Design a protein around this ligand. Structure first.
Ligand SMILES: CCCCCCCCCCCCCCCCCC(=O)OC[C@H](CO[C@@H]1O[C@H](CO[C@H]2O[C@H](CO)[C@H](O)[C@H](O)[C@H]2O)[C@H](O)[C@H](O)[C@H]1O)OC(=O)CCCCCCCCCCCCCCCCC
Ligand SMILES: CCCCCCCCCCCCCCCCCC(=O)OC[C@H](CO[C@@H]1O[C@H](CO[C@H]2O[C@H](CO)[C@H](O)[C@H](O)[C@H]2O)[C@H](O)[C@H](O)[C@H]1O)OC(=O)CCCCCCCCCCCCCCCCC
Ligand SMILES: CCCCCCCCCCCCCCCCCC(=O)OC[C@H](CO[C@@H]1O[C@H](CO)[C@H](O)[C@H](O)[C@H]1O)OC(=O)CCCCCCCCCCCCCCCCC
Ligand SMILES: CCCCCCCCCCCCCCCCCC(=O)OC[C@H](CO[C@@H]1O[C@H](CO)[C@H](O)[C@H](O)[C@H]1O)OC(=O)CCCCCCCCCCCCCCCCC
Ligand SMILES: CCCCCCCCCCCCCCCC(=O)OC[C@H](CO[C@@H]1O[C@H](CS(=O)(=O)O)[C@@H](O)[C@H](O)[C@H]1O)OC(=O)CCCCCCCCCCCCCCC
Ligand SMILES: CCCCC/C=C\C/C=C\C/C=C\C/C=C\CCCC(=O)O
Lengths: 6, 179, 39, 370, 185, 241, 406, 101, 40, 85
């Protein structure tokens, strides 16, 4: 999905 | 100053243990419910439902100290051990050598248990050998002759048991003044 | 218990994902146009 | 003379050292079979009687006379006593041994209307079977009031008064004695205490308690919600009391007589002397035996705990032809009931002399403290 | 089988963090930064003041306090508004007000405990005639440190009132474990 | 030295107890499967303590030396008998008494008025509270934890219904007279709820919401972090650890 | 139509049919392969080493390449041999082989319940190793190598040295091996296994007396404890079957009955004077096989309890105690024999050894035992462990990968 | 700072839920699906097929029956909007063709 | 010593076969030794 | 934990004196509180003041056996040593 979300 | 960490029991077992226990809950109280479902005189009220680790982490730490010393304790090591389990699911000299090795190990651990446990101080502790230079300096500059002799007994217990458990072959070899 | 030994005697016979949504703002802001228009 | 109390065929004397399962070899293996027609009849005939009674009840609810309501309630209670006998066979693992899951589900579903637990019931009845006619230990059974205990609550409590000297004088001197299975049912909950039980059977005991609790929390509010107190006494409470009357009468006539003694262990108590000599077989008319599902024939089930219910009268005929003088029979009549109510109340532990309450009280009353 | 005299008391994992090393336990406010007993201890053995902050907030967190639930999801908003949503100046003046109020309520509780000692002596006279008229100072400190359950207080008071026995005390109340209801809290 | 011999001993004792509990749980699962050897005794599953810890405690102790719950003495000897650990939950007789008075009050109210909500929300909740009180008779097991949770759920539902919806038989003509409020039944159920919370509810704390990827951001376990990554839909995000 | 007499007879039928059933259920294990009671060591050697399939050993083989191997208990005790005996070098090869076989049978069959006898009874008095020239233990038990053997005629000659090994178990109150040596070539092995005073079990006995390396007396027996001096049918059948299996030839009587064994000897008791290496080998095989059969039948033995209820169990317990007392007294009045090897270690010390150790009877003293029986659980769960839900997920991923790849 | 550090170590899940999950993956998809079904006419294309295409393009995942977006489009879409029309057409064409009614 | 050696052979050991290229003791081998050191 | 028992005793004496009314001299180590004429409740108030001053929890079991100023300072110093752990 998104790298900064995890 | 950050002193050395290569300490066989203390800052290896405790270190790896808190590292392992800090990553997950590892609480299985509810899984004890099957202990209350054992005397139903019926058919049901098993398989991979067992989500409990029946392995001591001390054994994995013994392995991780046999290697890379004499990788850490995580779930990848346990998965590798499970995978290796799934993929795996003239003689008198051998007898003499095997007997010498096992009696050395047995005597060493017998001496370790007797000195460290048969002498607060409740749980059985199996202290470990390989005194380093720091330990040697502490025991030489401080403590006493008895406390040095205890470490020497810890050192020599295996050879003492090897000597005590060995067949003298002179009385089996020599046949019939000082006869 | 009172029936501890009797109960002992008669018992011994004498997919991988969650059901969650996916974010729609990872590609466009256009889904944010529905909120004020519907409000 | 022992037909002076309706105890018709009486037993002379039994030698000790014998075990009741020992006599199972007297029963041929043809009786230990599965008759599917007999099983279906044993479930269906009392269920047919219960359905007929309830259809009558929905026919005439309150326009009916009291005696007509009482007769219909007696029919429903007798049908449920037959269904409870079926559930007792399911608890004893001898109704459908091929399907233990269906056996357990059927027993629990047929014991839920009685507010009884299948695991607790089979536990207490196995305890009663292992301690049959044995003093101070059987509990789950018609343990008599011994003159020693009447003496205790007669002198250690002071004079002739007392809570257990008024409760006992109300129960074991009056026809409410024929409804003491209500007290047995209250005792059967074990205080809702799990500490009596093995820790490995906690889930079974909890589920066995929960299914009657599910009944009393779901079906009973629906009954009071569909007729009130008038629709609850006539629909559930009167059949419940009739079923408890049948259970009390069968249990009281099974193991209580002047010629049957109650001895503690080590005093001379023996399993054979307590089972195939300490059991009185109640005899009922054949429609009553069919409706009660042969629940008065408990002696062959005691001597062979794998013998199915439908073969019980045939196996009892075999045992009465084989054993001979050791068995006791009694026809169902007013004589047995009036003797159990007015005469056999207190058991002195000296010559198995069941006596009226007062006559024994008189001894421990005008003597002991006097 | 291997029954060791004393019936085995299972030692469950802790559910609450152990109280801080600067705590008083007596409803009195703790000190501002330093718990004031360090001055009566040697230097370089007072290392366990920061070794309480570590393993009270970093390394020995009980896993019952890391549980994610609906109540903790709601409570994160309260804590976030307290820490990053409210200015530290207003937090400081509210902290001063709470400190003063807690000092006042500690003085009130101390006076109440002394009056309970007087009531202890009175109930110990009515029940032993006139002989025993003292009071248990250990029980006084137990009331002050909130180590007593209300049932223990009532049982001890009744015990004084009808047999005396000042120095026969109820058991100390165990700490209340953190309640958990699945995904709710 | 000490403080590390003590720490090592406590770690060894805790790990031995964890291994013994895991071993008896797995042995239970295999014995119920009929996959056990013939020498296995299921009574060993009743050994709660680890055998080595039991032996160490034997060594230590050999080198060193109103009518509920249990008994009752009433101002003569053993005066603080209610606080003794009898094996049951403290609120067992309270929840059994509340079940009894709820069933009795519901039956009496439905008989007196004719409304069926008092009997349906009466005996129906009293049976659940009686089952919870039965399950709380041994409050050291999973049935004990489940019983206290079920009793709290029933009492919280009673409080919620009383203070949100109200009682149907208490419906009146005026809107201000309807007034769901909090009467004695809701007060008793809330007091029981507070009693459960303030006596014991810990147990089955492993059942919570599944751990977020924010939990395992600083976790030292790459396998656990990747498992949470994959379960929460991310999966293919580069870990770079 | 049944009669009280025939009800009692029917009880008798059931009662002794259960006995018959138990007896054949105990003999059936040895009925098929009696040579398996002796050739078990050779069969375990032919089985060879077992690769230890534990996850720790598998990880050791995967990383270091070192393979952990285990052996069966039979070849384990064959590797051990005599063991750490203090006098293991001066003994005869026949005595050493017999001691190794019987001690290995003890440590293998009676595992997880074999305790060492309490040291305050035999070891704190220094009776584990006694020397004739040092009766007061002035050399801390090192006299066997600290003192040279006496010269001929010189006081102390002949020197007598006795080493004892006393064990306990769940079903056995005393398993005693005594090895005695003397300068005139005489060596004595005395192995006695005592059941407790709760089992209807015979006392196992063996005495091997040899002079100058030649065996002169060899006795093996399951001495009964009952009043009629007869054994149970399983013991009689096992002894007859083992005699047929291993004795084979030789003279059929071979029983001098030297006026003292007649009160303790079983009808199938063996007391020979071996004449030939073939007869000695046959006796050694028979004796090892009989000891293994005795220990194997010890596994399913059930203790006899009494008190309330019935008194025939109390009569059986009194018969057991009387039989054990009779055996101990008959071995104590043996002073026209083996006690002559004593007296060199005094007469009062001979009494204080004979009564206290070996043949000792007491109603009130039962030796404590430690039945672990959970080391089986620990070894089972080291062989077949559970690795947790995370490892289950990892193995699921691996299985899916191999399914999609292979 | 000590209390913030303690609370930040305690929570560690609620902060990710409130910073990543709560709007973008819980509330916003629900809001846009409800808003779209409230806005667009009761048409099969506008209530099912066009939101299917738009959600697939915006999220990179087709709404499989294992996905909650499919069930939101099945209830707030097909069931709330086009199922009445489908019902009428079905009861007047297929149900008699099945022989019923 | 003999008892611990007999119970240690059956558990397993590293044979000196030189297929390559013991200070802590494992858990079952520690249970065996602690059971042997029970005494009385 | 190497508690300065001299400092602990000096501050304990100061607290005892401050509460009662005596000077620092009259509060001697071996002096009993009974000598100073602190009543039962007053002794309890003194223990409370000691708890407040040292910011520690007094060892409840054993507070009935605090007789000397030296005993009070010794129990307090043991608690100061046991606090750090
Ligand atoms: C010399 C300067 C002149 C003024 C100074 C003193 C005069 C007036 C002081 C403030 C007003 C009265 C305060 C009384 C009750 C405290 C209010 C409260 O709820 O309690 C506040 C708590 C207490 O602070 C923190 O509290 C934490 C939690 O403890 C307590 O936290 C709560 C206390 O409410 C609960 O009671 C809980 O049970 C208890 O544990 C810690 O323990 C610490 O004490 C501390 O970190 O803070 C929190 O969580 C909430 C944070 C924000 C709340 C702000 C409330 C008031 C702000 C006033 C701003 C106006 C500015 C003008 C100046 C004039 C002031 C009127
Ligand atoms: C510190 C706080 C401690 C708690 C204090 C309150 C405890 C009082 C006991 C509960 C009660 O007053 O409650 C009384 C009980 C109530 O029973 C329950 O009653 C509920 C409705 O009660 C409501 O209606 C009732 C009248 O109908 C009362 O007004 C009650 O206050 C109000 O809440 C349910 O709907 C059911 O009918 C039933 O389960 O009645 C009864 O007479 C029970 C008595 C029967 C004998 C056994
Ligand atoms: C009529 C039926 C009941 C209707 C409602 C009546 C309320 C029942 C609650 C009281 C039970 C007390 C008890 O169990 O004592 C028995 C308890 C048990 O005792 C404690 O138990 C713990 C668990 O093991 C630990 O052992 C502690 O050491 C021990 O002290 O003793 C106490 O008094 C401890 C504190 C009680 C908890 C709070 C009481 C709840 C009521 C007040 C809350 C008001 C909130 C209103 C909103
Ligand atoms: C309304 C009916 C009230 C019935 C509940 C209390 C009566 C008997 C139960 C009992 O013995 O309490 C026993 C329980 C304590 O219960 C014990 O507590 C221990 C504490 O750790 C342990 O947890 C034990 O496991 C637990 O059994 O006490 C109470 O909850 C009530 C005691 C008194 C509190 C209020 C006074 C109530 C007065 C009415 C009757 C007296
Ligand atoms: C009816 C519903 C009642 C909800 C549960 C009440 C009691 C639960 C509890 O332990 O309160 C613990 C909570 C914090 O939650 C705790 O908060 C912790 C973080 S922190 O303390 O705010 O730093 C968090 O780690 C933990 O999971 C969470 O339980 O502490 C409180 O201040 C309670 C206030 C509200 C009651
Ligand atoms: C008709 C149902 C068929 C099942 C028949 C099996 C009989 C079981 C009944 C057991 C005993 C029931 C009544 C017990 C009387 C209790 C009162 C006095 C007890 C004292 O102490």
């Amino acid at each position: 999905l998104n790298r900064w979300s995890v | 100053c950050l002193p050395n960490i290569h300490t066989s029991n203390i800052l290896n077992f405790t270190k790896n243990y808190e590292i392992f226990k800090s990553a997950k809950d590892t609480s299985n109280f509810g899984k004890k419910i099957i202990l209350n479902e054992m005397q139903n005189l019926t058919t049901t009220s098993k398989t991979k439902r067992e989500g409990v680790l029946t392995m001591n982490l001390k054994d994995y730490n013994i392995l991780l100290n046999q290697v890379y010393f004499a990788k850490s304790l995580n779930f990848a090591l346990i998965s590798h051990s499970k995978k290796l389990k799934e993929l795996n699911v003239k003689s008198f000299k051998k007898k003499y050598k095997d007997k010498a090795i096992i009696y050395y190990e047995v005597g060493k651990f017998v001496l370790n248990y007797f000195l460290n446990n048969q002498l607060t101080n409740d749980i059985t502790i199996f202290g470990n050998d390989f005194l380093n230079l720091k330990t040697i300096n502490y025991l030489s500059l401080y403590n006493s002759k008895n406390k040095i002799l205890l470490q020497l007994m810890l050192i020599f217990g295996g050879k003492i048991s090897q000597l005590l458990s060995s067949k003298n072959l002179v009385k089996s070899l020599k046949q019939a003044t000082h006869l | 218990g009172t029936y501890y030994f009797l109960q002992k005697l008669l018992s011994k016979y004498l997919n991988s994902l969650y059901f969650v949504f996916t974010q729609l703002n990872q590609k466009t802001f256009l889904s944010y146009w529905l909120l004020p228009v519907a409000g | 003379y022992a037909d002076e109390w309706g105890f018709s065929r009486v037993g002379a004397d039994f030698p000790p050292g014998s075990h009741p399962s020992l006599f199972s070899q007297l029963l041929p293996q043809a009786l230990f079979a599965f008759d599917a027609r007999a099983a279906v009849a044993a479930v269906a005939v009392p269920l047919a009687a219960m359905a007929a009674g309830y259809g009558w009840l929905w026919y005439m609810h309150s326009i009916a006379p009291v005696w007509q309501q009482a007769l219909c309630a007696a029919l429903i209670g007798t049908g449920y006593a037959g269904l409870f006998k079926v559930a007792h066979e399911c608890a004893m693992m001898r109704f459908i041994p091929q399907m233990p899951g269906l056996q357990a589900a059927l027993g629990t579903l047929l014991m839920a209307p009685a507010l009884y637990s299948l695991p607790s019931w089979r536990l207490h009845h196995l305890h009663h079977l292992l301690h049959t006619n044995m003093l101070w230990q059987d509990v789950w059974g018609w343990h008599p009031l011994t003159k020693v205990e009447l003496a205790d609550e007669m002198v250690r409590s002071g004079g002739s008064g007392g809570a257990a000297m008024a409760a006992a004088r109300l129960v074991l001197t009056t026809p409410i004695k024929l409804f003491a299975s209500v007290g047995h049912w209250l005792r059967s909950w074990d205080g809702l205490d799990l500490r009596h039980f093995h820790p490995a059977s906690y889930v079974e005991v909890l589920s066995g308690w929960a299914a009657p609790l599910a009944f009393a929390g779901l079906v009973l509010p629906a009954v009071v919600s569909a007729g009130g107190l008038s629709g609850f006494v006539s629909c559930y409470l009167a059949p419940w009391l009739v079923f408890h009357f049948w259970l009390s009468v069968l249990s009281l006539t099974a193991h209580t007589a002047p010629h049957i003694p109650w001895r503690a262990e080590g005093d001379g108590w023996d399993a054979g002397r307590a089972a195939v000599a300490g059991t009185v077989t109640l005899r009922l008319p054949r429609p009553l035996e069919v409706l009660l599902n042969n629940a008065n024939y408990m002696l062959p089930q005691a001597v062979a705990p794998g013998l199915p219910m439908w073969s019980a009268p045939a196996a009892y005929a075999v045992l009465a032809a084989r054993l001979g003088p050791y068995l006791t029979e009694a026809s169902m009549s007013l004589k047995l009931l009036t003797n159990h109510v007015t005469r056999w109340q207190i058991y002195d532990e000296e010559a198995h002399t069941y006596r009226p309450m007062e006559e024994v009280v008189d001894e421990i009353e005008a003597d002991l403290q006097q | 089988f291997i029954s060791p005299m004393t019936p085995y008391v299972p030692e469950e994992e802790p559910t609450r963090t152990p109280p801080s090393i600067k705590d008083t336990g007596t409803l009195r406010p703790a000190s501002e930064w330093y718990p004031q007993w360090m001055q009566y201890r040697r230097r370089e053995d007072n290392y366990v003041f920061w070794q309480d902050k570590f393993m009270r907030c970093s390394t020995d967190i009980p896993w019952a306090e890391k549980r994610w639930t609906l109540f903790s999801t709601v409570w994160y908003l309260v804590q976030q508004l307290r820490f990053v949503g409210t200015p530290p100046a207003l937090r400081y003046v509210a902290f001063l007000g709470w400190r003063a109020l807690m000092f006042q309520v500690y003085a009130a509780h101390k006076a109440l405990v002394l009056w309970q000692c007087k009531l202890d002596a009175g109930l110990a006279r009515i029940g032993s005639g006139g002989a025993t008229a003292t009071f248990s100072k250990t029980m006084a400190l137990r009331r002050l440190h909130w180590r007593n359950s209300p049932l223990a207080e009532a049982l001890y008071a009744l015990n004084l009132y009808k047999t005396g026995r000042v120095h026969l005390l109820p058991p100390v109340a165990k700490p209340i474990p953190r309640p958990t209801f699945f995904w709710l809290f | 030295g000490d403080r590390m011999s003590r720490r090592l001993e406590d770690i060894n004792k805790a790990e031995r107890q964890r291994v013994w509990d895991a071993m008896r749980v797995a042995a239970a699962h295999r014995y119920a499967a009929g996959q056990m050897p013939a020498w296995f005794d299921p009574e060993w599953l009743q050994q709660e303590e680890a055998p080595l810890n039991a032996m160490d405690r034997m060594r230590g102790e050999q080198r060193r030396i109103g009518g509920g719950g249990g008994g009752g003495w009433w101002r003569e000897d053993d005066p603080y008998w209610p606080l003794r650990d009898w094996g049951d939950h403290p609120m067992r007789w309270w929840t059994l008494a509340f079940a009894a008075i709820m069933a009795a009050g519901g039956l009496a109210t439905s008989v007196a008025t004719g409304y069926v909500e008092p009997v349906q929300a009466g005996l129906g909740a009293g049976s659940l509270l009686a089952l919870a009180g039965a399950a709380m008779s041994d409050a050291r097991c999973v049935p004990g934890a489940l019983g206290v949770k079920l009793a709290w759920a029933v009492c919280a539902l009673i409080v919620l219904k009383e203070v949100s919806v109200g009682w149907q038989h208490k419906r009146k003509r005026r809107l201000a007279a309807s007034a769901p409020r909090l009467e004695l039944t809701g007060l008793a159920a809330a007091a029981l709820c507070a009693g459960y919370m303030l006596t014991d509810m810990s147990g089955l704390g492993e059942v919570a919401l599944p751990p977020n990827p924010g939990a395992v951001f600083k976790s030292p376990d790459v396998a656990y972090r990747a498992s949470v990554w994959q379960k929460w839909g991310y999966g293919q995000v580069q870990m770079r650890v | 139509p049944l009669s009280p007499e025939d009800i009692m007879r029917l009880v008798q039928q059931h009662e002794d049919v259960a006995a018959a059933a138990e007896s054949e259920q105990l003999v059936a294990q040895f009925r098929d392969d009696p040579q398996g009671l002796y050739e078990y060591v050779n069969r375990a050697y032919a089985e060879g080493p077992r690769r230890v399939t534990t996850p720790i050993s598998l990880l050791q083989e995967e990383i270091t390449g070192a393979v952990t191997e285990s052996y069966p208990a039979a070849v384990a005790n064959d590797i051990i041999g005599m063991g750490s005996w203090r006098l293991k070098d001066d003994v005869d090869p026949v005595i050493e082989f017999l001691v190794a076989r019987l001690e290995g049978c003890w440590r293998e069959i009676l595992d997880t319940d074999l305790c060492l006898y309490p040291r305050e009874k035999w070891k704190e008095q220094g009776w584990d190793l006694v020397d004739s020239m040092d009766p007061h233990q002035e050399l801390e038990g090192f006299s066997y190598a600290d003192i040279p053997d006496p010269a001929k005629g010189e006081a102390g000659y002949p020197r007598l040295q006795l080493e004892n090994r006393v064990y306990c178990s769940k079903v056995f109150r005393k398993l005693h091996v005594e090895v005695g040596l003397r300068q005139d070539g005489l060596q004595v092995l005395h192995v006695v296994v005592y059941p407790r005073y709760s089992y209807d079990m015979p006392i196992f006995g063996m005495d091997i007396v040899m002079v100058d390396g030649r065996v002169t007396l060899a006795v093996v027996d399951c001495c009964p404890v009952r009043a009629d001096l007869k054994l149970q049918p399983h013991y009689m059948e096992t002894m007859a079957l083992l005699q047929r299996t291993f004795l084979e030839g030789t003279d059929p009587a071979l029983r001098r009955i030297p006026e003292w064994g007649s009160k303790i000897f079983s009808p199938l008791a063996l007391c020979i004077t071996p004449s030939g290496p073939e007869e000695l080998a046959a006796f050694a095989k028979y004796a090892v096989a009989l000891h293994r059969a005795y220990l194997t039948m010890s596994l399913n033995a059930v203790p006899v309890v009494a008190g309330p209820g019935d008194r025939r169990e109390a009569a059986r317990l009194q018969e057991i105690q009387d039989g054990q007392k009779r055996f101990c007294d008959n071995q104590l009045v043996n002073k026209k024999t083996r006690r002559v090897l004593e007296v060199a270690m005094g007469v009062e010390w001979t009494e204080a050894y004979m009564s206290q150790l070996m043949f000792d009877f007491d109603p009130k003293y039962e030796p404590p035992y430690f039945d672990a029986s959970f080391e089986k659980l620990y070894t089972y769960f080291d062989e077949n462990p559970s690795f947790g839900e995370m490892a289950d997920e990892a193995m699921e991923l691996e299985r899916g990968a191999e399914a999609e790849r292979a | 700072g000590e209390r913030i550090w303690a609370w930040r170590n305690r929570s560690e899940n609620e902060r990710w839920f409130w910073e990543v999950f709560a709007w973008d993956r819980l509330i916003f998809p629900i809001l846009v699906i409800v808003a779209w079904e409230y806005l667009v006419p009761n048409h099969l294309v506008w209530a099912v097929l066009a939101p299917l295409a738009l959600l697939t393009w915006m999220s990179g995942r087709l709404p499989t029956p294992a996905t909650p977006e499919f069930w939101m489009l099945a209830y707030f879409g097909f069931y709330r909007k086009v199922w009445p029309d489908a019902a009428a057409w079905l009861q007047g064409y297929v149900v008699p063709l099945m022989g019923f009614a | 010593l003999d008892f611990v050696t007999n119970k240690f052979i059956t558990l397993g050991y590293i044979a000196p076969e030189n297929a390559n290229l013991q200070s802590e003791l494992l858990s079952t081998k520690e249970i065996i030794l602690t059971n042997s050191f029970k005494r009385f | 934990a190497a508690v300065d028992k001299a400092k602990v005793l000096e501050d304990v004496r100061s607290i005892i004196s401050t509460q009662l009314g005596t000077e620092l001299e009259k509060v001697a180590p071996e002096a009993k509180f009974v000598d100073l004429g602190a009543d039962s409740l007053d002794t309890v108030e003194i223990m409370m003041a000691l708890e407040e001053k040292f910011e520690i929890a007094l060892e409840e079991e054993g507070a009935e056996k605090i007789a000397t100023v030296q005993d009070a300072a010794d129990m307090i110093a043991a608690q100061i040593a046991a606090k750090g752990n």
